[PDB]
Ligand binder design. Structure first.
Ligand code: CLA
Ligand code: CLA
Ligand code: CLA
Ligand code: CLA
Ligand code: CLA
Ligand code: CLA
Ligand code: CLA
Ligand SMILES: CCCCCCCCCCCCCCCC(=O)OC[C@H](COP(=O)(O)OC[C@@H](O)CO)OC(=O)CCCCCCCCCCCCCCC
Ligand SMILES: CC1=C(/C=C/C(C)=C/C=C/C(C)=C\C=C\C=C(C)\C=C\C=C(C)\C=C\C2=C[C@H](C)[C@H](O)CC2(C)C)C(C)(C)C[C@@H](O)C1
Ligand SMILES: CC1=C(/C=C/C(C)=C/C=C/C(C)=C/C=C/C=C(C)/C=C/C=C(C)/C=C/C2=C(C)CCCC2(C)C)C(C)(C)CCC1
Ligand SMILES: CC1=C(C/C=C(\C)CCC[C@H](C)CCC[C@H](C)CCCC(C)C)C(=O)c2ccccc2C1=O
Ligand code: SF4
Ligand code: SF4
Lengths: 142, 75, 80, 225, 729, 139
């Protein structure tokens, strides 16, 4: 019986009154109707606008959890391919030069081999190459 | 034709070209200073107008500073 | 006046002396470096603390350091 | 032209003479000065001669231009505000078939523009009703832009009010963080130079202010005719 | 030159920097010429006496001016309508319009209106006539005189304390915990019982007859026999009218809970049992540390015993570090005072104690804003003086391997993770706000990202809020915690479950967004202060920063340029972020409470999700009454507030000269002015004594920050007071 | 006293002030082989004579700036410039070069003062020398 102050938009008089006039974002003439029918399934406040629930419950998993994993996969992909390209370009006798002039073949090669980034990162951490010892890192005076 | 009747166009044109003018004047000052630093040569400017400008500059800056303070204060 | 100190890491490169605009530094004979010379600051009462000497020093951190202290007419660079 | 026009014209004169003072001092003292007698050897674009002589920040001609940009902005802003309010209050409007004229702001310039409170309430507050209320209509792009102008301005203060040593130390810590994961770049990052910091600050400041004024004027003048 | 006698380097300066830096470094005793530890401590002791005397004089002056030119004896007869009066106005520069406008509060002369809420405080503690106010003012004058004389006396050569007397931590802690806290709170409970409550029940008790009338019909017999429950019998009824005997009980120590039905404030008997119990707890705590009788704990043994296997040395040698360093103690005290000042604000705006103070909305807003700003200042000062400690007092060999010296070991990790959390908050918070703004702008506000503050609503439910239907803990009438028969449960649940008060205000999505923004501000200000404190000893750019002191301008343009590198610069930067965070906090509080007081909570509930709502419904909307304080048509009582509003908008801008433009330009200009003065006939007769120079770099930053802060405070103070007074007052 | 023959200059407002005759001034003397034009560090350009020249300035930095200009900005270089400090009592102290040899080059007879025998990282901790009126470099 959570959210006793929240009611589904399908049963919210404010949403019912205000959803007849939803604008069309694209040139598609039915996009307002599509928006109304998709937002009727959410939890709405007294103002007839959908609210999201992020307490972790799976009934509202599409509110945060699914987009959460969707973001995380892409962000990990970008970070892993960047780190791999930097590491492989370091020992090229001019890593600084190849940072402003991108090595397109190697860049794309790292782009493709980056969907398996979680497994690669997990394997690398177990292999000790993901992190460096604190005695092997420059430090500022205390 | 029909420009003065269009108030938005009047205001826009006025403000736009005035901003352009202000930027141009500031650039004039900047590149004049650039010339003075770089292209100036003392040997070619003995007692000319440029030299005599450079020789009473304290008077210029002092009197101009006074007029700025006077204008700011009273206005 | 400001205090200018030269530590034992100087390599006798003379850059600090030339960079000084108020003639405070000097080159003196030494033995701890290959160049067999070191920097001295006999006229620190004329130093204005412009830090050009430090900017010219090529050693790690600075073999020559300038600490700003009591301000006099000379050290403030006043013409009036 | 009356008392208010007199005061505004003399304000224009004041701001213009001050901008001329800054730029003229920059040009005349570029070669050298009493404080620094060999400014020419340091170039046109240098940040300072050091903390010596009590502090020699912003002695080059470049810094004089950097300081003159703000005063040019102030002067031109006052000029365009004068033009806008005077035109709206005494010239622009509508004509009845009898022959009478009804101005946009009903001639309030001659009595409100003589105090700063007038320029705040009767001009900046009263005439901003057309831009803040622009959401939901075709003028919304101005309202957005208006807020955008109010943002970048503030953003520029990060660069004008600070110095590069703090950012260099912060970058040192962040570089340690990226070094721990073996992801440090070959091109060592550095905080922006003093001259670059001043340039970034003045650029973002001018952009924000001018965008604010443009959005305000366009949204106001597209709602009266 | 004689001035400044405490420094010889500044005394030989021929310029005007001598005067500025003499004023600046006057109260920094730790670096005076020929200063000993003993003399330093004694001077500090006398100066602290001085600040206490000044505080007492300030309170006496407040009381005296209220009693003299106020309307207290008429305010008590109708606290819900009459406006309290602060002090009279005597401005010869006034015109007739201002005289007619400021003759307010039913007075007969120009007069101010008090917004410090002292009338409510005086009424609540039983002061009903201005003669009592006058007597209090005179007594405070005498107390201030006594403290000034005490400072003078303990400065004398034979009454001069020793160094060991200043380093007796155990005895000081015992005496100040048991006596300064426990005994004082016990005496306050006694004042409430013997005087305040009988005055609330329409009985006049003063010095002339307090020794006769007992507070309770059974005096001191049940207390010693053990029949304490007698004092809690027959409490005040809900139909009690404050200040009269109508429907009043005879109990003195109760746990009624909730709020008084009329005054909408906590029950005075609750205050009595609360302060008495606190006094007992403090008196027990004060007997903890051994002084000279063998019994008691010793702090050094405690600290050295609590060593950890993961921290190497644990809290070893921290006693010596804290006892030898004054900046460590000052930082700890400032942090604690700031935390409890913020606590005071939070727990007072929601649990009012003084009678009828909830109705007077302007005073509540002013008190919250004032004590919150003070808390922010104190929190900044804690970190600043901790950084000063790291520069001066920290010893890397005495503190070897303890927790303090171990922070520097993993300081880079601290700063990096803190910067990450600040960036993570800022990016996504600004993204959500801008997303909502753009979505609403395109006329489709139904696509806003609106997250319900679930966790805080759950907390409210646990405390017993049944609106959200979580039925957990006190909201669950079947859980153990809600069935213990605790005496406070019925009244407390009655108070929390009514929307008529600020006790646990209902929250929504905009509240979520603004709390996360406040978290961003807090973490960022903490990042600046912590980075400055940890980098005070040195960094890669300046490994020897300690040898340069705490506040130095720069290291010149070498090594890439080193502007704003000292820890003082970190303080100077973090002050801006403190101000910005306080601005966000107070704007949120003020808008929410304006909606609550007007009843139009829907306005905040709708328009607080995007920034245009903040700009329009809060800034633009509420300014209408303020800026019309004086008009071409006339002037009303808000004229002074409009003038101060513009005054702040002016000083704030004036600070930008020092914050943006730097020294060399002004030095060259001053050289030209000097030339002009020296060559002017009839003006060479008058010549200066100290050679004019431009302000130093650090002085410039300080002056700009001061102008900035003064304008920032004054503008918002004027806006808040004017808006709330015009709308409601 | 000193030599004479001032350079041919029209004067300016950027020259000496009261301090010159109340605290100190500075003199620089040099012998040039041609009557040519140089740049005055006080604004404007002046013609220096063929032979010996003497010039009075207000700061030592100005004298050394003019010396740098003389040494570097002329094809026949000038190496004999001398800089003195002129006190208001007429006492003249010969400042630069100190021993007659330029400070940029090593020469015998110098004292090697201002030199620490330790690295900048071995300075004593500030806390240990508290209440001594000395900063770590001072010891
Ligand atoms: C204090 C903060 C907090 C935190 C960190 C969580 C965390 C969590 N809650 Mg949650 N919750 C909270 C407060 C919190 N809750 C409150 C205050 C309420 C009451 C309103 C709830 C009510 C609630 C319900 C009803 C449910 C959760 C569930 C969950 C879990 C979701 C599983 C998941 O995404 O991991 C998996 C992640 C990956 C695979 C990647 C997760 C561990 C769900 C659960 O049972 O999971 C264990 C669930 O059904 N929560
Ligand atoms: C006819 C016009 C004109 C011309 C030909 C020049 C030519 C030159 N200028 Mg000059 N200048 C001008 C106008 C002009 N200027 C004006 C109006 C000003 C006043 C602002 C200046 C101020 C100025 C300074 C202060 C300096 C020069 C310098 C220079 C030299 C080259 C370096 C440079 O600026 O390029 C490189 C230029 C850039 C990289 C600028 C790009 C970044 C700009 C600021 C961003 C603009 C953004 C735009 C307005 C909006 C975008 C919004 C965004 C969201 C996309 C060159 C001789 C420099 C010099 O000393 O060289 C000798 C120098 O230091 N100028
Ligand atoms: C029982 C004995 C006793 C008592 C009463 C005191 C009392 C005091 N000592 Mg002290 N002292 C003692 C023994 C004692 N000392 C001994 C034995 C030693 C030697 C070991 C010392 C050594 C010592 C030193 C070295 C110093 C003091 C100082 C002080 C004063 C601190 C000033 C202050 O803030 O007080 C007022 C504090 C309070 C009233 C309580 C604090 C408030 C807390 C935060 C709770 C807030 C209350 C409530 C919530 C708000 C009320 C709101 C209301 C206004 C509406 C205070 C008067 C300092 C000083 O300079 O004083 C002259 C100082 O420097 N003492
Ligand atoms: C802490 C400050 C304080 C002080 C100075 C007083 C002072 C006084 N109270 Mg009081 N009182 C206080 C707190 C205080 N009270 C509190 C917190 C309560 C709890 C509700 C009471 C409850 C109370 C009652 C119910 C009565 C008094 C009475 C009295 C008066 C004489 C009895 C007495 O105290 O002798 C104390 C004598 C003792 C033998 C106590 C033991 C020795 C102590 C520890 C020393 C006296 C004016 C009586 C009164 O008004 O006189 C007729 C009375 O009937 N008081
Ligand atoms: C219990 C309070 C307390 C105490 C005893 C001290 C004690 C000390 N502080 Mg500290 N400090 C505190 C709180 C405190 N601080 C707080 C809260 C902050 C945060 C803002 C700071 C920030 C701070 C810094 C940043 C520094 C000190 C320093 C010092 C040392 C003395 C130098 C000094 O500040 O005097 C001189 C003080 C001044 C010149 C202040 C004058 C400014 C005035 C008060 C502002 C007035 C504005 C304007 C006139 C208002 C008019 C309004 C009108 C127009 C309407 C000394 C150890 C300095 C130090 O390092 O010492 C070693 C130092 O650099 N403190
Ligand atoms: C509105 C003004 C403004 C803004 C946005 C920032 C933003 C920031 N400051 Mg800051 N600062 C400001 C004013 C401002 N400051 C002022 C006036 C001062 C006083 C001098 C300071 C002093 C200060 C200090 C001392 C520190 C910061 C730090 C930070 C960062 C902390 C992260 C954060 O809070 O949000 C996250 C960041 C943002 C929200 C900003 C990004 C905004 C854009 C829109 C994101 C996307 C970039 C954009 C697409 C690029 C397009 C460019 C193209 C059009 C040309 C962040 C970059 C701290 C830091 O470095 O953190 C690590 C830090 O140490 N600032
Ligand atoms: C509101 C902000 C503000 C204000 C008031 C000023 C004011 C001033 N600036 Mg400044 N400046 C500012 C912002 C501001 N600046 C910013 C943001 C920048 C960054 C770019 C600069 C950059 C800048 C430069 C680069 C220069 C100035 C200059 C000047 C001076 C111009 C002369 C003048 O107006 O008459 C004097 C000042 C006023 C008339 C101000 C009004 C004072 C009121 C009306 C009078 C008060 C009455 C009386 C004092 C009351 C006494 C009260 C009693 C308690 C003592 C003046 C002191 C120029 C200068 O040096 O002067 C020529 C100059 O070269 N400023
Ligand atoms: C409300 C804010 C939530 C986030 C706050 C900060 C986020 C990160 C905080 C983690 C502390 C750092 C890692 C622990 C630091 C660490 O591992 O210290 C080691 C310590 C173990 O202590 P020992 O028993 O060795 O001794 C502790 C004492 O005896 C002496 O220090 O672990 C903890 O105490 C962890 C709890 C710290 C809280
Ligand atoms: C692997 C990788 C990298 C490196 C990554 C590293 C090294 C990571 C290191 C991380 C460390 C050391 C620590 C991490 C801590 C993480 C914590 C504490 C997570 C907490 C999670 C919580 C509290 C979840 C909370 C809720 C969970 C649930 C979904 C609810 O509904 C919502 C909500 C918010 C309540 C990079 C950076 C190099 C590059 C990347 O592309 C990949
Ligand atoms: C650097 C330094 C420094 C500074 C720093 C600072 C100042 C800090 C601060 C800090 C802070 C300021 C902190 C805070 C904290 C807090 C906390 C830690 C809290 C806690 C709380 C809790 C735990 C609670 C709980 C609860 C609840 C929630 C409810 C119920 C009840 C209870 C109570 C249980 C010093 C000087 C010191 C020293 C030297 C160095
Ligand atoms: C924030 C700040 C920094 C730190 C800022 C840095 C290091 C700049 C970082 C810039 C990033 C890397 C890129 C952003 C700007 C780009 C032009 C964006 C390009 C966008 C396109 C790719 C779309 C300084 O270095 C500094 C120096 C002197 C005075 C003040 C300051 C100062 O305030
Ligand atoms: S610049 Fe540095 S290394 Fe070179 S001589 Fe001078 S002190 Fe020695
Ligand atoms: S603060 Fe910056 S600009 Fe000023 S003297 Fe130091 S390095 Fe130069």
């Amino acid at each position: 019986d959570d959210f006793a102050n929240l009611t589904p938009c399908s049963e919210n008089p404010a949403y019912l009154a205000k959803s007849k006039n939803f604008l069309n974002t694209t040139n598609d003439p039915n996009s307002g109707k599509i928006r109304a029918e998709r937002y009727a399934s959410a939890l709405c406040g007294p103002e007839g606008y959908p609210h999201l629930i992020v307490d972790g419950r799976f009934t509202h998993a599409g509110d945060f959890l699914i987009p959460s994993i969707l973001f995380l996969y892409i962000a990990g992909w970008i970070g892993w391919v960047g780190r791999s390209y930097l590491i492989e370009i370091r020992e090229s006798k001019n890593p600084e030069m190849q940072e402003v002039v991108i090595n397109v073949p190697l860049a794309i090669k790292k782009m493709l081999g980056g969907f398996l980034w979680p497994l690669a990162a997990v394997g690398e951490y177990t292999s000790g190459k993901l992190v460096m010892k604190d005695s092997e890192i420059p430090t500022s005076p205390r | 034709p029909y420009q003065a009747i269009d108030y938005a166009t009047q205001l826009s044109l006025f403000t736009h070209h005035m901003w352009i003018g202000g930027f141009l004047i500031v650039g004039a000052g900047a590149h004049g200073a650039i010339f003075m630093v770089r292209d100036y040569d003392p040997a070619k400017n003995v007692n000319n107008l440029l030299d005599r400008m450079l020789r009473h500059r304290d008077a210029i800056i002092s009197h101009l500073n006074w007029v700025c303070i006077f204008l700011g204060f009273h206005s | 006046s400001h205090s200018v100190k030269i530590y034992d890491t100087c390599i006798g490169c003379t850059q600090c002396v030339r960079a000084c605009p108020l003639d405070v530094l000097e080159m003196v004979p030494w033995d701890g470096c290959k160049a067999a010379q070191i920097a001295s600051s006999p006229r620190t009462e004329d130093c204005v603390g412009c830090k050009r000497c430090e900017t010219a020093c090529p050693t790690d951190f600075l073999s020559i350091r300038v600490y700003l202290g009591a301000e006099t007419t000379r050290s403030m660079g006043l013409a009036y | 032209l009356g008392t208010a026009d007199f005061m505004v014209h003399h304000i224009h004169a004041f701001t213009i003479h001050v901008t001329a003072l800054i730029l003229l001092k920059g040009v005349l003292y570029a070669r050298s000065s009493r404080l620094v007698p060999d400014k020419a050897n340091l170039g046109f674009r240098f940040p300072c001669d050091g903390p010596g002589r009590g502090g020699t920040c912003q002695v080059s001609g470049w810094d004089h231009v950097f300081l003159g940009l703000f005063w040019m902005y102030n002067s031109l802003s006052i000029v365009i505000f004068h033009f806008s309010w005077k035109m709206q209050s005494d010239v622009w409007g509508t004509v009845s078939p009898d022959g009478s004229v009804t101005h946009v702001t009903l001639g309030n310039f001659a009595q409100s523009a003589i105090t700063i409170n007038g320029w705040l309430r009767d001009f900046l507050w009263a005439q901003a009703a057309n831009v803040i209320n622009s959401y939901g209509s075709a003028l919304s792009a101005y309202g957005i832009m208006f807020l955008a102008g109010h943002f970048v301005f503030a953003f520029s203060l990060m660069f004008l009010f600070s110095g590069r040593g703090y950012w260099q130390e912060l970058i040192e810590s962040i570089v340690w963080a990226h070094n721990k994961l073996n992801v440090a770049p070959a091109i060592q990052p550095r905080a922006l130079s003093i001259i670059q910091g001043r340039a970034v600050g003045v650029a973002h400041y001018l952009l924000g202010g001018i965008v604010t004024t443009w959005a305000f004027f366009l949204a106001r003048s597209l709602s009266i005719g | 030159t004689k001035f400044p006698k405490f420094s010889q380097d500044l005394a030989q300066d021929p310029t005007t920097r001598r005067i500025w830096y003499g004023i600046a470094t006057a109260h920094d005793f730790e670096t005076h010429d020929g200063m000993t530890e003993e003399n330093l401590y004694q001077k500090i002791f006398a100066s602290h006496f001085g600040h206490i005397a000044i505080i007492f004089l300030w309170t006496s002056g407040t009381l005296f001016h209220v009693a003299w030119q106020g309307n207290f004896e008429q305010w008590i007869k109708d606290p819900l309508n009459i406006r309290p009066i602060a002090h009279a106005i005597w401005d010869p520069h006034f015109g007739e319009g201002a005289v007619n406008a400021f003759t307010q509060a039913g007075a007969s002369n120009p007069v101010n209106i008090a917004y410090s809420g002292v009338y409510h405080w005086f009424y609540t503690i039983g002061m009903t006539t201005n003669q009592e106010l006058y007597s209090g003012a005179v007594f405070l004058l005498v107390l201030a005189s006594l403290f000034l004389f005490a400072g003078w006396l303990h400065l004398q050569p034979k009454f001069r304390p020793s160094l060991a007397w200043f380093k007796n931590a155990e005895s000081r802690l015992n005496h100040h915990l048991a006596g300064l806290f426990g005994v004082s709170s016990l005496a306050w409970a006694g004042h409430l019982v013997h005087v305040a409550i009988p005055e609330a029940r329409g009985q006049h008790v003063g010095w002339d007859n307090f020794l006769s009338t007992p507070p309770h019909p059974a005096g001191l017999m049940p207390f010693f026999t053990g029949n304490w429950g007698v004092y809690a019998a027959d409490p005040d009824t809900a139909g009690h009218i404050f200040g009269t005997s109508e429907g009043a009980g005879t109990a003195i120590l109760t746990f009624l809970g909730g709020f008084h039905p009329q005054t909408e404030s906590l029950w005075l008997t609750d205050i009595a049992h609360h302060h008495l119990a606190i006094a007992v707890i403090f008196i027990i705590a004060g007997h903890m540390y051994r002084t000279n009788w063998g019994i008691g704990h010793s702090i050094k043994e405690i600290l050295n015993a609590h060593k950890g296997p993961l921290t190497g040395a644990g809290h070893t040698n921290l006693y010596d570090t804290i006892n030898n360093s004054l900046h460590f103690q000052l930082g700890l005290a400032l942090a604690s005072l700031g935390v409890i000042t913020s606590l005071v604000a939070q727990h007072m705006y929601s649990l009012p104690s003084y009678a009828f103070i909830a109705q007077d909305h302007t005073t509540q807003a002013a008190l919250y804003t004032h004590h919150q700003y003070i808390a922010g200042f104190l929190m900044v000062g804690a970190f600043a003086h901790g950084a000063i400690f790291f520069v001066r007092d920290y010893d890397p060999v005495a503190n070897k391997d303890n927790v303090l010296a171990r922070m520097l070991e993993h300081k880079e990790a601290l700063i990096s993770h803190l910067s990450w959390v600040s960036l993570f908050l800022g990016f996504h918070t600004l993204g959500l706000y801008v997303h909502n703004d753009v979505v609403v702008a395109f006329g489709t506000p139904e696509k806003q990202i609106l997250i319900e503050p679930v966790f805080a609503q759950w907390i409210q439910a646990t405390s017993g809020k049944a609106l959200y239907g979580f039925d957990v803990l006190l909201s669950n009438p079947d859980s153990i915690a809600s069935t213990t028969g605790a005496a406070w449960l019925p009244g407390w649940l009655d108070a929390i479950n009514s929307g008529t008060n600020s006790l646990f205000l209902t929250i929504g999505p905009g509240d979520f967004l603004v709390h996360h923004a406040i978290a961003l501000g807090l973490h960022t200000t903490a990042l600046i202060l912590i980075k400055g404190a940890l980098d005070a000893r040195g960094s890669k750019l300046m490994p020897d920063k300690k040898d340069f002191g705490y506040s130095f301008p720069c290291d010149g343009p070498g090594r890439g340029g080193t502007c704003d590198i000292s820890a003082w610069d970190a303080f100077y930067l973090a002050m801006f972020w403190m101000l910005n965070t306080l601005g966000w906090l107070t704007f949120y509080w003020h808008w929410k409470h304006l909606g609550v007081w007007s009843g139009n909570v829907a306005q905040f509930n709708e328009n607080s999700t995007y920034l245009m709502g903040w700009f329009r419904d809060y800034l633009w909307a509420n300014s209408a009454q303020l800026i019309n304080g004086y008009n071409p048509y006339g002037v009303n009582n808000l004229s002074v507030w409009a003038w101060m509003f513009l005054f702040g908008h002016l000083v704030w801008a004036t600070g930008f000269m020092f914050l943006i433009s730097w020294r060399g330009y002004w030095q060259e200009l001053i050289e030209t002015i000097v030339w002009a003065h020296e060559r002017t006939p009839l003006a060479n007769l008058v010549r200066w004594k100290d050679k004019p120079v431009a302000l130093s770099i650090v002085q410039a930053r300080l002056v700009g920050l001061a102008h900035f802060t003064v304008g920032y405070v004054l503008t918002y103070a004027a806006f808040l007071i004017a808006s709330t007074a015009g709308k409601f007052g | 006293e000193l030599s004479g023959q001032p350079p041919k200059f029209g004067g300016s407002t950027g020259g000496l002030l009261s301090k010159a005759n109340r605290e100190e001034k500075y003199a620089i003397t040099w012998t040039s082989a041609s009557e040519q034009v140089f740049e005055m560090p006080t604004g404007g350009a002046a013609i220096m004579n063929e032979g010996e020249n003497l010039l009075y300035l207000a700061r030592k930095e100005q004298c050394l700036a003019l010396g740098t200009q003389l040494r570097t900005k002329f094809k026949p270089k000038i190496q004999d410039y001398k800089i003195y400090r002129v006190y208001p009592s007429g006492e003249v102290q010969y400042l630069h070069p100190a021993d007659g040899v330029f400070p940029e080059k090593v020469n015998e007879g110098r004292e090697a003062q201002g030199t620490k025998t330790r690295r900048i990282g071995q300075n004593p901790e500030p806390v240990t020398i508290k209440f001594s009126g000395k900063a770590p470099y001072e010891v």
